[PDB]
């Protein structure tokens, strides 16, 4: 439902993987943690998982 600009960080909460992302067009204050199942951006994810 909302365009994702980039993945800032990652964590495991409740056995669930979550991504801290920033939405394009919105302020950093709007950044939110979203479980991986909420994302539709394999490019950013695959790219983030490689930057480690």
């Amino acid at each position: 439902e909302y365009a994702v600009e980039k993945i800032i960080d990652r964590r495991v909460r409740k056995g669930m993987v979550e991504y801290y992302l920033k939405w394009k067009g919105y302020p950093e204050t709007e950044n939110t943690w979203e479980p991986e199942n909420n994302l539709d951006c394999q490019d950013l994810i695959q790219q983030y998982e490689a930057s480690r």
């Binding site: 439902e1 909302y2 365009a3 994702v4 979203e34 909420n38 539709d40 951006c41 490019d43």
Partner: peptide, 6 residues
């Protein structure tokens, strides 16, 4: 790309 916002 995109993502659901909770």
């Amino acid at each position: 790309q995109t993502a659901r916002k909770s």
